[PDB]
């Protein structure tokens, strides 16, 4: 099922994955399939006086490389050999060909800052996103399963049916998929 | 000449300005007219063992808006009034309607991280960008004229002849267009 595709270190994007991108007002791009769900989400947040942005939508391989390299540079500057920096940067940034952002199913949502702080948007999304098919992909209690640190901006479209189950079930996507495969 | 357009609070982007955009491999977009020059710039950089990336090309009004609001929020959070936060934010980020990035003639160039540092790239661009017809639009010593802070990553396409002149004359774009008079 298309919305449940697993992309992680162990599950790279399939060769020749087709994606039709819609362009948002801010120039970011998303899978046309998630557009009205994301639109509903933003509509709802604003109706609650919460004002989010799409910081990052679709990213190309090259784009994913540059974010990753910038992340590595940051850790080198904090006293990491480049070998240490790579491994450490990879807990924040997926190596190219393993970011969900390469599907067009992930958005990194932030506050517009002026009407809302990061924390208010992050809270709101955590409690609400599932109603619109989006999950908090990388919660702090599952970093030992996802391989990724607490990333309160990164929301993954999986669809309403699945997001609600995952949210109630209190699980990460890997667990949910693993538990679906078992039964 | 089309490439010398000045753009600021006084000179908002013209109504229906015509951008003719191209996607780069990182997903950033540039006016197609600057494509060969940017490619020549990265080629020469890479040839010099210097490894730049385009962190930002074309931006929508809304994209510009979002950067500016994020900047304003950073200043509000460090105790600036709404009016100060905006004032301060504007020295780093142009207001929508006044950015060169909305022309697709401006690129933010950073280091690729692991082959070069930002300063090495910033240094290189400083000394070589004009050959490809880009200028360091916002030099430190012209913040009074340009109304923008030192932004060593921001390069404006103006053309090789144009960029070369401005660089030797040591001037900022505002200055050169007043030279023309
Ligand atoms: Zn993300
Ligand atoms: Zn810029």
mmCIF file of C-alpha atoms and ligand atoms in Angstrom:
data_model
loop_
_atom_site.group_PDB
_atom_site.id
_atom_site.type_symbol
_atom_site.label_atom_id
_atom_site.label_comp_id
_atom_site.label_asym_id
_atom_site.label_seq_id
_atom_site.Cartn_x
_atom_site.Cartn_y
_atom_site.Cartn_z
ATOM 1 C CA UNK A 1 0.000 0.000 0.000
ATOM 2 C CA UNK A 2 1.542 3.172 -1.481
ATOM 3 C CA UNK A 3 1.355 5.469 1.530
ATOM 4 C CA UNK A 4 3.006 2.887 3.811
ATOM 5 C CA UNK A 5 6.256 2.546 1.941
ATOM 6 C CA UNK A 6 9.156 2.156 4.399
ATOM 7 C CA UNK A 7 12.262 4.227 3.639
ATOM 8 C CA UNK A 8 15.128 4.026 6.188
ATOM 9 C CA UNK A 9 18.857 3.048 6.338
ATOM 10 C CA UNK A 10 17.804 -0.579 5.625
ATOM 11 C CA UNK A 11 15.084 0.290 3.045
ATOM 12 C CA UNK A 12 16.408 2.647 0.318
ATOM 13 C CA UNK A 13 14.071 4.234 -2.191
ATOM 14 C CA UNK A 14 13.304 1.818 -5.074
ATOM 15 C CA UNK A 15 15.206 2.412 -8.307
ATOM 16 C CA UNK A 16 13.026 4.499 -10.667
ATOM 17 C CA UNK A 17 10.400 5.513 -8.060
ATOM 18 C CA UNK A 18 7.899 7.764 -9.941
ATOM 19 C CA UNK A 19 6.594 10.841 -8.138
ATOM 20 C CA UNK A 20 4.291 13.636 -9.361
ATOM 21 C CA UNK A 21 5.138 16.786 -7.439
ATOM 22 C CA UNK A 22 2.850 19.668 -6.657
ATOM 23 C CA UNK A 23 4.507 23.059 -5.987
ATOM 24 C CA UNK A 24 3.499 24.942 -2.797
ATOM 25 C CA UNK A 25 3.381 28.743 -2.591
ATOM 26 C CA UNK A 26 6.805 28.774 -0.842
ATOM 27 C CA UNK A 27 8.351 26.800 -3.715
ATOM 28 C CA UNK A 28 8.697 23.546 -1.756
ATOM 29 C CA UNK A 29 7.263 20.476 -3.596
ATOM 30 C CA UNK A 30 5.196 17.530 -2.409
ATOM 31 C CA UNK A 31 3.643 14.376 -3.748
ATOM 32 C CA UNK A 32 0.351 15.623 -5.357
ATOM 33 C CA UNK A 33 -1.316 12.752 -3.488
ATOM 34 C CA UNK A 34 -0.770 14.358 -0.002
ATOM 35 C CA UNK A 35 -1.673 17.951 -1.134
ATOM 36 C CA UNK A 36 -5.307 18.202 0.141
ATOM 37 C CA UNK A 37 -4.361 16.369 3.406
ATOM 38 C CA UNK A 38 -1.494 18.805 4.028
ATOM 39 C CA UNK A 39 -3.810 21.693 3.080
ATOM 40 C CA UNK A 40 -6.417 20.410 5.588
ATOM 41 C CA UNK A 41 -3.724 20.143 8.250
ATOM 42 C CA UNK A 42 -2.523 23.739 7.745
ATOM 43 C CA UNK A 43 -6.130 24.987 7.642
ATOM 44 C CA UNK A 44 -6.866 23.289 10.956
ATOM 45 C CA UNK A 45 -3.690 24.572 12.695
ATOM 46 C CA UNK A 46 -4.479 28.171 11.644
ATOM 47 C CA UNK A 47 -8.091 27.788 12.828
ATOM 48 C CA UNK A 48 -6.412 26.965 16.172
ATOM 49 C CA UNK A 49 -4.210 30.085 15.907
ATOM 50 C CA UNK A 50 -1.165 27.834 15.160
ATOM 51 C CA UNK A 51 0.817 29.028 12.049
ATOM 52 C CA UNK A 52 3.094 26.375 10.476
ATOM 53 C CA UNK A 53 5.375 26.440 7.425
ATOM 54 C CA UNK A 54 6.768 23.788 5.178
ATOM 55 C CA UNK A 55 10.521 24.266 5.731
ATOM 56 C CA UNK A 56 11.376 21.224 3.604
ATOM 57 C CA UNK A 57 9.311 19.087 1.206
ATOM 58 C CA UNK A 58 10.599 16.952 -1.669
ATOM 59 C CA UNK A 59 14.438 16.826 -1.806
ATOM 60 C CA UNK A 60 16.580 15.380 -4.595
ATOM 61 C CA UNK A 61 19.476 13.029 -3.968
ATOM 62 C CA UNK A 62 21.925 15.868 -4.444
ATOM 63 C CA UNK A 63 19.898 18.017 -1.995
ATOM 64 C CA UNK A 64 19.972 15.225 0.593
ATOM 65 C CA UNK A 65 23.761 14.991 0.111
ATOM 66 C CA UNK A 66 24.277 18.738 0.793
ATOM 67 C CA UNK A 67 22.146 18.745 4.022
ATOM 68 C CA UNK A 68 24.063 15.612 5.135
ATOM 69 C CA UNK A 69 27.464 17.218 4.313
ATOM 70 C CA UNK A 70 26.490 20.427 6.145
ATOM 71 C CA UNK A 71 25.490 18.299 9.128
ATOM 72 C CA UNK A 72 28.883 16.542 8.955
ATOM 73 C CA UNK A 73 30.679 19.922 8.773
ATOM 74 C CA UNK A 74 28.843 21.048 11.966
ATOM 75 C CA UNK A 75 30.075 17.975 13.859
ATOM 76 C CA UNK A 76 33.693 18.350 12.554
ATOM 77 C CA UNK A 77 33.594 21.958 13.921
ATOM 78 C CA UNK A 78 32.479 20.650 17.323
ATOM 79 C CA UNK A 79 35.550 18.389 17.638
ATOM 80 C CA UNK A 80 34.692 15.310 15.569
ATOM 81 C CA UNK A 81 36.969 13.531 13.103
ATOM 82 C CA UNK A 82 35.120 13.268 9.790
ATOM 83 C CA UNK A 83 34.556 9.544 10.528
ATOM 84 C CA UNK A 84 32.923 10.428 13.896
ATOM 85 C CA UNK A 85 31.018 13.302 12.309
ATOM 86 C CA UNK A 86 29.526 11.053 9.572
ATOM 87 C CA UNK A 87 28.178 8.444 12.005
ATOM 88 C CA UNK A 88 26.856 11.216 14.271
ATOM 89 C CA UNK A 89 25.374 13.382 11.487
ATOM 90 C CA UNK A 90 23.469 10.226 10.324
ATOM 91 C CA UNK A 91 21.356 10.338 13.572
ATOM 92 C CA UNK A 92 19.982 13.689 12.233
ATOM 93 C CA UNK A 93 20.058 13.323 8.445
ATOM 94 C CA UNK A 94 19.347 10.243 6.317
ATOM 95 C CA UNK A 95 22.046 9.222 3.894
ATOM 96 C CA UNK A 96 20.995 9.919 0.269
ATOM 97 C CA UNK A 97 18.503 7.407 -1.106
ATOM 98 C CA UNK A 98 17.101 6.758 2.407
ATOM 99 C CA UNK A 99 15.328 10.072 3.176
ATOM 100 C CA UNK A 100 11.531 9.978 3.057
ATOM 101 C CA UNK A 101 11.884 13.531 1.687
ATOM 102 C CA UNK A 102 12.982 11.830 -1.530
ATOM 103 C CA UNK A 103 9.468 10.313 -1.841
ATOM 104 C CA UNK A 104 7.626 13.632 -1.515
ATOM 105 C CA UNK A 105 5.742 12.137 1.480
ATOM 106 C CA UNK A 106 7.706 13.962 4.166
ATOM 107 C CA UNK A 107 7.402 17.581 5.232
ATOM 108 C CA UNK A 108 9.557 19.306 7.820
ATOM 109 C CA UNK A 109 7.170 21.716 9.457
ATOM 110 C CA UNK A 110 8.331 24.721 11.487
ATOM 111 C CA UNK A 111 6.603 27.794 13.041
ATOM 112 C CA UNK A 112 6.290 31.004 10.962
ATOM 113 C CA UNK A 113 7.938 32.269 14.134
ATOM 114 C CA UNK A 114 6.086 35.602 14.174
ATOM 115 C CA UNK A 115 2.556 34.242 15.065
ATOM 116 C CA UNK A 116 3.752 30.950 16.650
ATOM 117 C CA UNK A 117 6.928 29.512 18.226
ATOM 118 C CA UNK A 118 8.461 26.144 17.139
ATOM 119 C CA UNK A 119 7.239 24.561 20.379
ATOM 120 C CA UNK A 120 3.566 25.509 19.755
ATOM 121 C CA UNK A 121 3.651 24.122 16.194
ATOM 122 C CA UNK A 122 5.469 20.997 17.381
ATOM 123 C CA UNK A 123 2.994 20.421 20.234
ATOM 124 C CA UNK A 124 0.025 21.004 17.868
ATOM 125 C CA UNK A 125 1.299 18.598 15.192
ATOM 126 C CA UNK A 126 2.127 15.886 17.771
ATOM 127 C CA UNK A 127 -1.457 15.971 19.061
ATOM 128 C CA UNK A 128 -3.264 16.523 15.724
ATOM 129 C CA UNK A 129 -1.309 15.457 12.641
ATOM 130 C CA UNK A 130 -2.652 11.922 12.612
ATOM 131 C CA UNK A 131 -6.145 13.278 11.964
ATOM 132 C CA UNK A 132 -4.792 14.315 8.548
ATOM 133 C CA UNK A 133 -2.659 11.244 7.704
ATOM 134 C CA UNK A 134 0.625 12.564 9.063
ATOM 135 C CA UNK A 135 2.736 10.944 11.751
ATOM 136 C CA UNK A 136 5.425 12.217 13.982
ATOM 137 C CA UNK A 137 7.995 10.096 12.230
ATOM 138 C CA UNK A 138 10.883 10.296 14.689
ATOM 139 C CA UNK A 139 9.599 10.580 18.274
ATOM 140 C CA UNK A 140 12.185 10.719 21.093
ATOM 141 C CA UNK A 141 10.998 7.398 22.644
ATOM 142 C CA UNK A 142 11.840 5.384 19.443
ATOM 143 C CA UNK A 143 15.279 6.704 18.353
ATOM 144 C CA UNK A 144 16.637 3.209 19.203
ATOM 145 C CA UNK A 145 14.308 1.714 16.551
ATOM 146 C CA UNK A 146 14.175 4.453 13.859
ATOM 147 C CA UNK A 147 17.905 5.232 14.093
ATOM 148 C CA UNK A 148 16.987 8.940 14.037
ATOM 149 C CA UNK A 149 17.064 11.515 16.846
ATOM 150 C CA UNK A 150 14.124 13.519 18.071
ATOM 151 C CA UNK A 151 13.024 15.494 14.985
ATOM 152 C CA UNK A 152 9.828 17.316 16.035
ATOM 153 C CA UNK A 153 9.468 18.974 12.539
ATOM 154 C CA UNK A 154 9.545 15.839 10.425
ATOM 155 C CA UNK A 155 6.066 14.603 9.536
ATOM 156 C CA UNK A 156 5.404 11.674 7.235
ATOM 157 C CA UNK A 157 2.202 11.168 5.285
ATOM 158 C CA UNK A 158 0.932 7.616 5.793
ATOM 159 C CA UNK A 159 -2.828 8.285 5.474
ATOM 160 C CA UNK A 160 -5.563 8.781 8.077
ATOM 161 C CA UNK A 161 -6.398 5.068 8.711
ATOM 162 C CA UNK A 162 -2.733 4.235 9.350
ATOM 163 C CA UNK A 163 -1.705 7.486 11.187
ATOM 164 C CA UNK A 164 -4.598 7.163 13.670
ATOM 165 C CA UNK A 165 -3.692 3.515 14.424
ATOM 166 C CA UNK A 166 0.028 4.393 14.809
ATOM 167 C CA UNK A 167 -0.873 7.365 17.082
ATOM 168 C CA UNK A 168 -3.280 5.378 19.318
ATOM 169 C CA UNK A 169 -0.919 2.329 19.189
ATOM 170 C CA UNK A 170 1.811 4.766 20.368
ATOM 171 C CA UNK A 171 4.231 3.205 17.846
ATOM 172 C CA UNK A 172 6.789 4.244 15.260
ATOM 173 C CA UNK A 173 6.243 3.300 11.600
ATOM 174 C CA UNK A 174 8.791 0.442 11.720
ATOM 175 C CA UNK A 175 6.927 -1.141 14.678
ATOM 176 C CA UNK A 176 3.544 -0.677 13.044
ATOM 177 C CA UNK A 177 4.743 -2.302 9.808
ATOM 178 C CA UNK A 178 6.508 -5.137 11.678
ATOM 179 C CA UNK A 179 3.318 -5.743 13.705
ATOM 180 C CA UNK A 180 1.253 -5.655 10.494
ATOM 181 C CA UNK A 181 3.530 -8.225 8.801
ATOM 182 C CA UNK A 182 3.349 -10.588 11.808
ATOM 183 C CA UNK A 183 -0.480 -10.988 11.912
ATOM 184 C CA UNK B 1 20.740 45.868 -20.021
ATOM 185 C CA UNK B 2 18.328 43.348 -18.480
ATOM 186 C CA UNK B 3 20.905 41.872 -16.058
ATOM 187 C CA UNK B 4 21.611 45.205 -14.180
ATOM 188 C CA UNK B 5 18.103 45.659 -12.650
ATOM 189 C CA UNK B 6 18.329 47.218 -9.162
ATOM 190 C CA UNK B 7 15.919 45.808 -6.621
ATOM 191 C CA UNK B 8 15.332 47.235 -3.098
ATOM 192 C CA UNK B 9 12.535 48.837 -0.974
ATOM 193 C CA UNK B 10 12.647 51.790 -3.399
ATOM 194 C CA UNK B 11 12.717 49.484 -6.472
ATOM 195 C CA UNK B 12 10.326 46.574 -5.735
ATOM 196 C CA UNK B 13 10.326 43.858 -8.424
ATOM 197 C CA UNK B 14 8.290 44.996 -11.400
ATOM 198 C CA UNK B 15 4.698 43.739 -11.729
ATOM 199 C CA UNK B 16 4.666 40.470 -13.743
ATOM 200 C CA UNK B 17 8.507 40.292 -13.874
ATOM 201 C CA UNK B 18 9.495 37.424 -16.199
ATOM 202 C CA UNK B 19 11.518 34.631 -14.659
ATOM 203 C CA UNK B 20 12.494 31.738 -16.911
ATOM 204 C CA UNK B 21 13.449 29.047 -14.390
ATOM 205 C CA UNK B 22 15.513 25.877 -14.633
ATOM 206 C CA UNK B 23 15.857 23.151 -11.973
ATOM 207 C CA UNK B 24 19.391 22.318 -10.786
ATOM 208 C CA UNK B 25 20.247 18.846 -9.528
ATOM 209 C CA UNK B 26 19.745 19.916 -5.830
ATOM 210 C CA UNK B 27 16.205 21.132 -6.679
ATOM 211 C CA UNK B 28 17.085 24.816 -6.507
ATOM 212 C CA UNK B 29 16.049 26.939 -9.473
ATOM 213 C CA UNK B 30 17.785 29.695 -11.395
ATOM 214 C CA UNK B 31 16.889 31.859 -14.306
ATOM 215 C CA UNK B 32 18.069 29.821 -17.348
ATOM 216 C CA UNK B 33 20.032 32.927 -18.626
ATOM 217 C CA UNK B 34 22.508 32.664 -15.689
ATOM 218 C CA UNK B 35 22.873 28.862 -16.061
ATOM 219 C CA UNK B 36 26.061 28.816 -18.255
ATOM 220 C CA UNK B 37 27.833 31.371 -16.016
ATOM 221 C CA UNK B 38 26.977 29.560 -12.786
ATOM 222 C CA UNK B 39 28.166 26.284 -14.359
ATOM 223 C CA UNK B 40 31.429 27.995 -15.405
ATOM 224 C CA UNK B 41 31.766 29.330 -11.848
ATOM 225 C CA UNK B 42 31.342 25.903 -10.191
ATOM 226 C CA UNK B 43 33.658 24.345 -12.839
ATOM 227 C CA UNK B 44 36.397 26.930 -12.080
ATOM 228 C CA UNK B 45 35.815 26.551 -8.308
ATOM 229 C CA UNK B 46 35.985 22.764 -8.444
ATOM 230 C CA UNK B 47 39.094 23.088 -10.738
ATOM 231 C CA UNK B 48 40.655 25.204 -7.946
ATOM 232 C CA UNK B 49 39.904 22.381 -5.462
ATOM 233 C CA UNK B 50 37.106 24.523 -3.953
ATOM 234 C CA UNK B 51 33.687 22.862 -3.470
ATOM 235 C CA UNK B 52 30.616 25.141 -3.405
ATOM 236 C CA UNK B 53 26.890 24.348 -3.305
ATOM 237 C CA UNK B 54 23.897 26.426 -4.253
ATOM 238 C CA UNK B 55 22.072 26.728 -0.893
ATOM 239 C CA UNK B 56 19.481 29.138 -2.380
ATOM 240 C CA UNK B 57 18.505 30.295 -5.906
ATOM 241 C CA UNK B 58 15.016 31.463 -6.952
ATOM 242 C CA UNK B 59 12.496 32.179 -4.165
ATOM 243 C CA UNK B 60 8.786 32.831 -4.256
ATOM 244 C CA UNK B 61 7.329 35.803 -2.403
ATOM 245 C CA UNK B 62 6.054 33.303 0.131
ATOM 246 C CA UNK B 63 9.446 31.654 0.501
ATOM 247 C CA UNK B 64 11.015 35.076 1.029
ATOM 248 C CA UNK B 65 8.209 35.827 3.500
ATOM 249 C CA UNK B 66 8.950 32.684 5.508
ATOM 250 C CA UNK B 67 12.706 33.343 5.824
ATOM 251 C CA UNK B 68 11.996 36.969 6.912
ATOM 252 C CA UNK B 69 9.364 35.846 9.469
ATOM 253 C CA UNK B 70 11.840 33.239 10.794
ATOM 254 C CA UNK B 71 14.529 35.948 11.089
ATOM 255 C CA UNK B 72 12.100 38.371 12.790
ATOM 256 C CA UNK B 73 11.096 35.645 15.273
ATOM 257 C CA UNK B 74 14.780 34.996 16.159
ATOM 258 C CA UNK B 75 15.148 38.742 17.096
ATOM 259 C CA UNK B 76 11.811 38.881 19.016
ATOM 260 C CA UNK B 77 13.045 35.848 21.022
ATOM 261 C CA UNK B 78 16.261 37.830 21.967
ATOM 262 C CA UNK B 79 14.258 40.721 23.393
ATOM 263 C CA UNK B 80 13.745 43.003 20.382
ATOM 264 C CA UNK B 81 10.400 44.769 19.973
ATOM 265 C CA UNK B 82 8.293 43.782 16.980
ATOM 266 C CA UNK B 83 9.521 46.963 15.135
ATOM 267 C CA UNK B 84 13.211 46.467 16.041
ATOM 268 C CA UNK B 85 13.069 42.706 15.257
ATOM 269 C CA UNK B 86 11.789 43.549 11.723
ATOM 270 C CA UNK B 87 14.282 46.415 11.234
ATOM 271 C CA UNK B 88 17.145 44.126 12.346
ATOM 272 C CA UNK B 89 15.780 41.179 10.289
ATOM 273 C CA UNK B 90 15.719 43.355 7.155
ATOM 274 C CA UNK B 91 19.523 43.895 7.278
ATOM 275 C CA UNK B 92 19.921 40.116 6.617
ATOM 276 C CA UNK B 93 16.780 39.314 4.577
ATOM 277 C CA UNK B 94 15.079 41.524 1.979
ATOM 278 C CA UNK B 95 11.339 42.047 2.266
ATOM 279 C CA UNK B 96 9.247 40.039 -0.287
ATOM 280 C CA UNK B 97 9.060 42.066 -3.502
ATOM 281 C CA UNK B 98 12.634 43.346 -3.015
ATOM 282 C CA UNK B 99 14.879 40.195 -3.075
ATOM 283 C CA UNK B 100 17.178 39.375 -6.009
ATOM 284 C CA UNK B 101 16.339 35.705 -5.367
ATOM 285 C CA UNK B 102 12.829 36.449 -6.644
ATOM 286 C CA UNK B 103 14.542 37.496 -9.936
ATOM 287 C CA UNK B 104 16.360 34.165 -10.108
ATOM 288 C CA UNK B 105 19.569 36.251 -10.617
ATOM 289 C CA UNK B 106 20.817 35.645 -7.061
ATOM 290 C CA UNK B 107 22.381 32.585 -5.455
ATOM 291 C CA UNK B 108 23.487 31.849 -1.935
ATOM 292 C CA UNK B 109 26.647 29.780 -2.277
ATOM 293 C CA UNK B 110 28.036 27.733 0.641
ATOM 294 C CA UNK B 111 30.741 25.106 1.029
ATOM 295 C CA UNK B 112 29.866 21.418 0.377
ATOM 296 C CA UNK B 113 30.962 20.885 4.001
ATOM 297 C CA UNK B 114 33.378 17.950 3.721
ATOM 298 C CA UNK B 115 35.735 19.171 0.924
ATOM 299 C CA UNK B 116 35.764 22.896 1.736
ATOM 300 C CA UNK B 117 34.806 25.263 4.574
ATOM 301 C CA UNK B 118 32.457 28.230 4.090
ATOM 302 C CA UNK B 119 35.357 30.729 4.451
ATOM 303 C CA UNK B 120 37.426 28.993 1.728
ATOM 304 C CA UNK B 121 34.454 29.237 -0.612
ATOM 305 C CA UNK B 122 33.596 32.747 0.548
ATOM 306 C CA UNK B 123 37.268 33.700 -0.053
ATOM 307 C CA UNK B 124 37.383 32.074 -3.483
ATOM 308 C CA UNK B 125 34.085 33.673 -4.616
ATOM 309 C CA UNK B 126 35.256 37.029 -3.327
ATOM 310 C CA UNK B 127 38.310 36.828 -5.623
ATOM 311 C CA UNK B 128 36.786 34.977 -8.602
ATOM 312 C CA UNK B 129 32.983 35.493 -8.882
ATOM 313 C CA UNK B 130 33.194 38.611 -11.174
ATOM 314 C CA UNK B 131 34.886 36.477 -13.944
ATOM 315 C CA UNK B 132 31.525 34.634 -14.304
ATOM 316 C CA UNK B 133 29.574 37.945 -13.974
ATOM 317 C CA UNK B 134 28.463 37.572 -10.342
ATOM 318 C CA UNK B 135 29.250 40.082 -7.596
ATOM 319 C CA UNK B 136 29.410 39.905 -3.787
ATOM 320 C CA UNK B 137 26.268 42.082 -3.699
ATOM 321 C CA UNK B 138 26.484 43.007 -0.016
ATOM 322 C CA UNK B 139 30.062 43.814 0.981
ATOM 323 C CA UNK B 140 30.757 44.622 4.624
ATOM 324 C CA UNK B 141 31.898 48.172 3.926
ATOM 325 C CA UNK B 142 28.736 49.207 1.983
ATOM 326 C CA UNK B 143 26.005 48.087 4.488
ATOM 327 C CA UNK B 144 25.063 51.820 4.776
ATOM 328 C CA UNK B 145 24.334 52.095 1.016
ATOM 329 C CA UNK B 146 22.900 48.573 0.382
ATOM 330 C CA UNK B 147 21.059 48.512 3.730
ATOM 331 C CA UNK B 148 22.098 44.844 4.113
ATOM 332 C CA UNK B 149 24.710 43.213 6.445
ATOM 333 C CA UNK B 150 27.873 41.416 5.299
ATOM 334 C CA UNK B 151 26.425 38.291 3.508
ATOM 335 C CA UNK B 152 29.449 36.578 1.955
ATOM 336 C CA UNK B 153 27.276 33.804 0.476
ATOM 337 C CA UNK B 154 24.956 36.095 -1.569
ATOM 338 C CA UNK B 155 26.017 36.469 -5.232
ATOM 339 C CA UNK B 156 24.064 38.534 -7.767
ATOM 340 C CA UNK B 157 24.367 37.886 -11.530
ATOM 341 C CA UNK B 158 25.017 41.170 -13.372
ATOM 342 C CA UNK B 159 27.215 39.883 -16.266
ATOM 343 C CA UNK B 160 30.937 39.472 -16.873
ATOM 344 C CA UNK B 161 31.732 43.005 -18.236
ATOM 345 C CA UNK B 162 29.514 44.566 -15.512
ATOM 346 C CA UNK B 163 30.825 42.394 -12.617
ATOM 347 C CA UNK B 164 34.445 42.912 -13.724
ATOM 348 C CA UNK B 165 34.027 46.757 -13.800
ATOM 349 C CA UNK B 166 32.306 46.883 -10.358
ATOM 350 C CA UNK B 167 34.984 44.664 -8.826
ATOM 351 C CA UNK B 168 38.026 46.694 -10.073
ATOM 352 C CA UNK B 169 36.244 50.031 -9.286
ATOM 353 C CA UNK B 170 35.603 48.462 -5.843
ATOM 354 C CA UNK B 171 31.942 49.681 -5.830
ATOM 355 C CA UNK B 172 28.543 48.158 -4.841
ATOM 356 C CA UNK B 173 25.664 47.846 -7.331
ATOM 357 C CA UNK B 174 23.828 50.922 -5.969
ATOM 358 C CA UNK B 175 27.050 52.936 -6.483
ATOM 359 C CA UNK B 176 27.667 51.699 -10.079
ATOM 360 C CA UNK B 177 24.076 52.461 -11.214
ATOM 361 C CA UNK B 178 24.431 55.986 -9.818
ATOM 362 C CA UNK B 179 27.831 56.176 -11.677
ATOM 363 C CA UNK B 180 25.869 55.456 -14.895
ATOM 364 C CA UNK B 181 23.632 58.324 -13.602
HETATM 365 ZN ZN1 LIG C 1 12.629 15.825 7.552
HETATM 366 ZN ZN1 LIG C 2 20.907 35.653 -0.864
#
